[PDB]
Design a protein around this ligand. Structure first.
Ligand SMILES: CS(=O)(=O)Nc1ccc([N+](=O)[O-])cc1Oc1ccccc1
Length: 121
């Protein structure tokens, strides 16, 4: 679920999902057009694609379980949708951590009109 993803993001990064990742660049918190602005935004692009892989799942609301094994995220077995959603979220959280070095506050509340053009998953 979105709330679980937000907790995972905070755990990974030390940033609150709202506001740090809820309105960032062209793809975080809202897709779905434009060239991603930076690596963090590309995490969101890929995460959006990852959810897009799951048209019959409901990633905003469906809850999954996960644990930590020495810092590592391990998605625990739920329904097929839950497992796949968890894997999408895990990847994005790791991606955000891997790109914290280049996170730029200037991309918070990035305006829509600067995000133009289709980029295929
Ligand atoms: C913000 S919301 O109402 O909870 N919906 C939603 C949540 C996350 C994302 N996103 O891009 O990560 C995008 C979201 O919304 C959109 C999905 C597709 C296209 C436009 C917006």
């Amino acid at each position: 679920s979105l709330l679980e993803f937000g907790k995972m993001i905070l755990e990974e990064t030390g940033k609150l999902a709202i506001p740090s990742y809820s309105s960032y660049g062209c793809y975080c918190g809202w897709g779905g057009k434009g060239t991603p602005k930076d690596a963090t935004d590309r995490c969101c692009f890929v995460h959006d694609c990852c959810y897009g892989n799951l048209p019959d799942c409901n990633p905003k609301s469906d809850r999954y379980k996960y644990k930590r094994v020495n810092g590592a995220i391990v998605c625990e077995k739920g329904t097929s949708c839950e497992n796949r959603i968890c894997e999408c979220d895990k990847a994005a959280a790791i991606c955000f951590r891997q790109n914290l070095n280049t996170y730029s506050k200037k991309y918070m509340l990035y305006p829509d009109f600067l995000c133009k053009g289709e980029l295929k998953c």
